[PDB]
Design a protein around this ligand. Sequence first.
Ligand SMILES: O=C(O)CNC(=O)C(=O)O
Ligand SMILES: O=C(O)CNC(=O)C(=O)O
Ligand SMILES: O=C(O)CNC(=O)C(=O)O
Ligand SMILES: O=C(O)CNC(=O)C(=O)O
Ligand SMILES: O=C(O)CNC(=O)C(=O)O
Ligand SMILES: O=C(O)CNC(=O)C(=O)O
Ligand SMILES: O=C(O)CNC(=O)C(=O)O
Ligand SMILES: [K+]
Ligand SMILES: [K+]
Ligand SMILES: [K+]
Ligand SMILES: [K+]
Ligand SMILES: [K+]
Ligand SMILES: [K+]
Ligand SMILES: [Mn+2]
Ligand SMILES: [Mn+2]
Ligand SMILES: [Mn+2]
Ligand SMILES: [Mn+2]
Ligand SMILES: [Mn+2]
Ligand SMILES: [Mn+2]
Ligand SMILES: [Mn+2]
Lengths: 289, 255, 252, 275, 271, 252, 277
Amino acid sequence: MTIAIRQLQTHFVGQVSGLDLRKPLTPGEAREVESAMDKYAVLVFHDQDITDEQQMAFALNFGQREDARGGTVTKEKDYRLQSGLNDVSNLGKDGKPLAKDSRTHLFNLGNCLWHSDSSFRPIPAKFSLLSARVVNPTGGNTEFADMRAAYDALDDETKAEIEDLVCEHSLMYSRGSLGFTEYTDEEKQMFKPVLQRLVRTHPVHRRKSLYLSSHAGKIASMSVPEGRLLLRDLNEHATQPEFVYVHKWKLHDLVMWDNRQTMHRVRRYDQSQPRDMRRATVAGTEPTV
Amino acid sequence: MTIAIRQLQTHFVGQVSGLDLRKPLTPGEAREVESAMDKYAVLVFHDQDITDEQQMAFALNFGQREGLNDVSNLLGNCLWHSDSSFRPIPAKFSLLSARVVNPTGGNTEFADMRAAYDALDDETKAEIEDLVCEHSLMYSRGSLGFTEYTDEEKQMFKPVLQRLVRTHPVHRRKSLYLSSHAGKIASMSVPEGRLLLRDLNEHATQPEFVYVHKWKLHDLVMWDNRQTMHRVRRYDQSQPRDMRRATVAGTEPTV
Amino acid sequence: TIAIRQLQTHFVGQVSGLDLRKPLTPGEAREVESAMDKYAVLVFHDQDITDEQQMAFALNFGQRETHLFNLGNCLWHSDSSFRPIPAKFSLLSARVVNPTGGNTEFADMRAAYDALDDETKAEIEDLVCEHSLMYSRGSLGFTEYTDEEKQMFKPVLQRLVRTHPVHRRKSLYLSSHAGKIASMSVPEGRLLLRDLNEHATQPEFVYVHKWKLHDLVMWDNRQTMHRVRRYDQSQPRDMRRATVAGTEPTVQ
Amino acid sequence: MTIAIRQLQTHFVGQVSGLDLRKPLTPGEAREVESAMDKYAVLVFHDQDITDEQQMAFALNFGQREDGLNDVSNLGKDGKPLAKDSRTHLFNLGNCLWHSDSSFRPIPAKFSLLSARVVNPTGGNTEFADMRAAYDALDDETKAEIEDLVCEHSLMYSRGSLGFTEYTDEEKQMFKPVLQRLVRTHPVHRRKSLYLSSHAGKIASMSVPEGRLLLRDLNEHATQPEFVYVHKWKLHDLVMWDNRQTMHRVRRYDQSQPRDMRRATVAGTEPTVQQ
Amino acid sequence: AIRQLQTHFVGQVSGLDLRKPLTPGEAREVESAMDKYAVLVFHDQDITDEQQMAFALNFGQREDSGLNDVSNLGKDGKPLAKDSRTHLFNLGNCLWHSDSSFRPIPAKFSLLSARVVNPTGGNTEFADMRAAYDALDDETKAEIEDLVCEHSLMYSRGSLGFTEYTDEEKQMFKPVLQRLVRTHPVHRRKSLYLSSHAGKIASMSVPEGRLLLRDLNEHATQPEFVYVHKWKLHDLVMWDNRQTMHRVRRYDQSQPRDMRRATVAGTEPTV
Amino acid sequence: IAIRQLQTHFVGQVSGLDLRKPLTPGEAREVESAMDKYAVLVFHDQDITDEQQMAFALNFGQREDTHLFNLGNCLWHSDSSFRPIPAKFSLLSARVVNPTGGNTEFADMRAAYDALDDETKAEIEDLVCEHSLMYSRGSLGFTEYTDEEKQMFKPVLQRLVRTHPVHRRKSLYLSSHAGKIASMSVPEGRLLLRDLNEHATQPEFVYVHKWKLHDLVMWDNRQTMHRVRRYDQSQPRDMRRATVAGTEPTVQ
Amino acid sequence: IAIRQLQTHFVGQVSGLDLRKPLTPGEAREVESAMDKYAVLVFHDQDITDEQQMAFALNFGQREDRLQSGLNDVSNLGKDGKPLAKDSRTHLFNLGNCLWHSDSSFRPIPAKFSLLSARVVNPTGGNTEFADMRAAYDALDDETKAEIEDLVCEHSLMYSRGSLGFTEYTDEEKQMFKPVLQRLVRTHPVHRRKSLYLSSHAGKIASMSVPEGRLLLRDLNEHATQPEFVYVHKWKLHDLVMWDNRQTMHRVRRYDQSQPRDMRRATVAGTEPTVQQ
Ligand SMILES: O=C(O)CNC(=O)C(=O)O
Ligand SMILES: O=C(O)CNC(=O)C(=O)O
Ligand SMILES: O=C(O)CNC(=O)C(=O)O
Ligand SMILES: O=C(O)CNC(=O)C(=O)O
Ligand SMILES: O=C(O)CNC(=O)C(=O)O
Ligand SMILES: O=C(O)CNC(=O)C(=O)O
Ligand SMILES: O=C(O)CNC(=O)C(=O)O
Ligand SMILES: [K+]
Ligand SMILES: [K+]
Ligand SMILES: [K+]
Ligand SMILES: [K+]
Ligand SMILES: [K+]
Ligand SMILES: [K+]
Ligand SMILES: [Mn+2]
Ligand SMILES: [Mn+2]
Ligand SMILES: [Mn+2]
Ligand SMILES: [Mn+2]
Ligand SMILES: [Mn+2]
Ligand SMILES: [Mn+2]
Ligand SMILES: [Mn+2]
């Protein structure tokens, strides 16, 4: 009836055991994992030595593939992986680490900022599923923040202030804060800003949460300076240690998160060493606006 | 009339009593205040009903002018910064007087850059020792959405160099020279540099290095820009907030 | 699974086996309230809760009832004793704890009463006190009040000796808000109250609470006094209060 | 969104919009709902898809649990409809009489809150009667006559009406009659109202037959259509009532069909009479 | 001459001296009027007990002078004590009922004469059980058609607090069966056979059966089915127990109320 | 002169003196040194006159220049602290002893000072209190003063920490007459005085004197506080005072 | 403490005490004096635990040498908490309480106070009656008083049980139930009133033949249990009745054994013997 789950942080995060992700799930098991995703927001599976196909098959229990187009500087040519998965590694087509100053790596440094995946899309992602294929031993922890806990801890005046606010999300905002400011020219059209609610409501349990993300570069109804200051304050509030779970990677871990309830980021790592990390993304169902 | 100092935070900040800033300082008083600034980096004076000229006269004990700077609301200041870090010779002391206090928000927060430096692991210390940052108003304003400037403006705000690790002239303690004005590290790519600056700013502004100052009427707070960062928290723009700053010019560069 | 450890000779229970993030069962609500009747003060460690969760916990026990408030809390008092229907339970949740000072102290007014001699007990049995914010603020140095403030803070009557509605133990109804005994001259009455307060807050009747992050302390204003000890106002402190309205008066 | 109230009947009953009962209330919202209960005596909320915990949590704004929802459904422990000759169902049928909740308790109930979880489509309307308006409409002579009268309330009396008249000694003590004023006064707005209830089987200072006949006349008077609001249930309705100002009853329903209704009861905060 | 006093029933009768014996045709007209109007009001009838009964006996036999004492007076022509055994049984008449419905063959006509009028209350109310039956919806009529009620004095007195009965009293007051819906033998109109004496429906549990009866009583005693009669001295009111219910309202027990009833026995059972 | 110590920190009982007789210079010298050391001196069986009591007092300096006074004495105080030059010694002679209550208690302000932590010593060092009869009578409930009285009872300044002119020991200058600290806000200063008073009058710093007929007790106001405990006011209590005027101010 | 006398000669109803709480020195002294005067005390609505009941009893002395406490189980229930079999060993022995007796009169130092608490009331029968042995003594004539003054009875459980049929005892039982001596006429240590020491356990007068002694005890018991000397207690839930075994007899009237009767007794050990032995 229930799968084995141990909670890893005071507010959220469950560790799951007893499931082999190389193999199909039963209807009951898929139902259990999704309820755990609703409750815990982040799930940690150890020792899941899976193929790209096995990983995506697992993800497809929970919806459909998110269309990857408009998500990277993909050159419209080709890259490393053959399957459905998003390549979130530090490797080129080469199979070995990207150059310190390449346009691909510099864009990938965006992942070091606190973000919710595909928040730059009119329908943002539901679940993201990350598999560790080669572990970089010098840094690159992945950190998760509970946006519902963060929301709850705000005072009434803040909650009343932010309730109806709308943010503009774009890859140009997140990469822009890192100094990556030149886009040509269908990129400016491909990364055209989308609207998202600052405060969102989960469809299952109806918990309210802060929809924070590096992609959010302004609040619609405010001046750019004031809006950004507010977002900075909310981001500082929401990423305090009491709302954060730090994941230390082991080989063949799978960590999956609900983008609708969380932010995440990768910490600085040594770029000269391989880091083979591969993501499956489940498309969102409904927009926030 | 005996100067008494009580330490307000684990690592820094001193509360000073027995001085009347309306009255000129004696040689011993000037020496003690500057010595406390060396030690505590931030000093808090309560109950100082002082004019603009008294504030400056107090300030001028410690050097020259960079009368007062208007930091009243009558927004870059909300970012963690060190004053005039975008100048080739950056500011020494800043002295802030509260003439009208905003009752809703507007705390001034102070971060100890020396304690922050010390808490770093020896590898990080070694990584950063010789690193140099570019500081400009264009960078700090840029964070708040001001990213385009004319050729006349580009020269007035032309970036200057400062070392990431500075050393205090008096006690020789090392400290992180962080500021919102710092937009890149000279020997690193813009994104890699800004990420390191982010990590250092995050580390250096944890609660264990931070003193939060809650304002009272006629409060004077003074700080060493060479040893600290500071920021003002969001305040109700509708209500008058009258804060007046005296600034002591720097007496040496960092590079 | 509720377990209570007694913390002081006369009173105070440390409660384990409850997660206050979750709604109480009717049985748990009954157990908690009976423990409040018995111990008068309950300490709950490790309760990392929200304002809403705190209030929800409180509302099992009844209904809902800055600088001047904080300062007055440094004097021995019982909450809202200046109201004709005074407070039942108060609840304090430690969100940010000041490391220097700010212990909260509690005194068992039932034990204080019991320790009085037979003649003192007979002397004070029918006495009535006048309670007002003007008296407690007076002690802090604010003696002058405008004509509309005088109505705003019009003194209320309270029995000096009250009886608990559940176990019917008598206790001394002492409070910084009490500034007069009705049947006595002003100075004699205040001297009697001063001696009663000194008696009632001897270390044998006092529990000292040294705060830990996420503590929740709930106390019965009908059986106790409390005070906060001196602390450095320049340090961060974040203590969140909930108060349950009184369900009965002491006089008319 | 803030609270709006719409009048549903000449003298009483309000329909409330703008409140989500899945969410904890602010102090202001608790105040507004209570004042509205004082004025309207019965409040109707539509579209409140709530859990038991959420229902109780809403209820606890207004006091304490009466000595954990009360199961006023027609269902057994297995979740299926009770048999029509089962002792549980025969007691539940007591709600079909005009009553005020816990009037057999020395300190009787304040608020009752009833949530429709599964609606029976064949009957089972809940009717409410305004005991204040009913009192006011009496002539001066009747008001003077009844002013100081006291009733005896017990489960033995309401269940007696329905055929259960023989009680063991344990039961006679467990259901020992309590005293209640016949004319009560609301603690907030001071309006007088008839404290009528099926649990009332006697007036203290009168013969049992003369008392019951007087009670029958007051009940007939107080439950004329002019003082009565008829509630037709929709799924996830919540109707809450002040037992201190009203009577209520459930109309006959089809016992073969499920009727899942769940009550939260706030304990009384003051007696009507000493004992 | 008959003047109709209410929407569905009740006739006021003029030009008849109840002191004088009735002709064959007058006995027929009065009875046909009772068939139609269910209740008849006679004004100014200063009649003796023997004269009252003589009028009654035109319509059948006495139910086992021969008049029923429905007064508030004791054996000495004086108002009864408020707490006395007889008065507390008289109070049974304050409940809506049909006369002798607890007898296996229930009463036909009842004839009440006003000898001394209590001026403080004590109106007699009548309810038309035919109009009441008619106003019910089709689904209800279907439900109630074949139902059978248990009638006993133990039930009506039970309501007023007399629940404890001896083995000997339990035989004297043994419940009788009566149809819930009865058909008048003359005009064939269906009517609700409601009564305070009815305490059970045969095929149902006591509580559910009693709840059904309450709903029926509530429906049937709405003001639209009820005629209120205010008493004048030497009034006589007669009713068909087979088509009606009646009750007396609260009266001042300190003041005399001398009312005398003549009961014609039933000529048919309902079961 | 033989001296017996009566409390852990202070108080000496003196035998070998007959106060009906003039003191020799040596006797006067030994008594004053004993006053410096013990702060309070107890002399049993001195059946003396007013004139003899004053003559005895006058060895130690000069004379200092109602119901309310007796009531004020129930509060912890140092005599004449509301005067710009406050009392040196006070002397109390027991002519008629009330059997019910009326113990006189003494608190050692030097021992009280010593036992404070370094932070508090640093905090208080240069603080200055305002002392006035309006403050002490305030605590008894008399808060309203005409401008005539406000001049008569004009507050005077005293050091919170004073130093004894002979042995140089620091001590807490506490008194019921002190109602404000000059450099602090009114409530915060009063709260600080309250904490210091509570600290200084703990049992470890207190000598309780139980009166015996013809006792004389002399105390140094510069080193102590004192108070009288409650007694039955309808019984006679004849306690005669002599006061030696101060010989040095604390500030200005 | 308020006391209302409930019978001509004795019995007091007590108001003002909550027996869930410790007594003060004054409260304990008042209760004991009330016991000296009224011999039987009735308390209503005392919803107490075993520990609380015993704590109340311990005010007046020490304990006498299903429940798991100091209390004597005088219920009709077995270990399982259900009514005993009507033919069982324990029940037939408990029926002993239906005879007029004074508690522990078969011990060399007999009981002081007994305190009985009603936890589950039997609805059919089970009244507890009490007889005033002092009033009974007073009403005897001068000659009878003179005759009995120095008589001594033998008390044993073998005698009380013998009268209900159990006449056969082994050597072991005969030693466990070895008869003890008690004065027939006893004196109260406080007010010095003489009273008849009657009991179902008394089966012999020492100086007389068994038949003549038993006939004399019968005459005294008949005299002493006349309605004028007897108070009848009808039980209510959480009643507590306390009696002085030194001045009274008591008995329980027959009760419906198929229904639970949960009655719990605390017994205070005697503080003085009646004979030196
Ligand atoms: O590589 C990492 O640890 C960070 N991952 C992501 O941001 C991602 O896959 O969405
Ligand atoms: O106004 C404030 O509190 C912030 N002040 C400054 O940043 C400043 O004057 O340099
Ligand atoms: O500890 C505190 O903050 C003071 N406590 C109180 O008096 C209170 O909150 O009611
Ligand atoms: O079931 C119904 O409609 C009526 N319910 C009640 O009487 C109740 O819950 O108190
Ligand atoms: O006395 C009355 O008016 C009531 N009449 C009857 O019920 C009757 O006599 O049948
Ligand atoms: O009377 C007493 O016990 C003490 N009196 C004094 O305070 C005094 O005379 O100075
Ligand atoms: O059970 C009873 O009523 C009487 N009981 C006793 O004899 C007893 O407990 O001593
Ligand atoms: K600046
Ligand atoms: K308060
Ligand atoms: K009920
Ligand atoms: K009849
Ligand atoms: K003085
Ligand atoms: K025995
Ligand atoms: Mn990501
Ligand atoms: Mn600045
Ligand atoms: Mn408080
Ligand atoms: Mn109900
Ligand atoms: Mn009739
Ligand atoms: Mn003095
Ligand atoms: Mn016994």
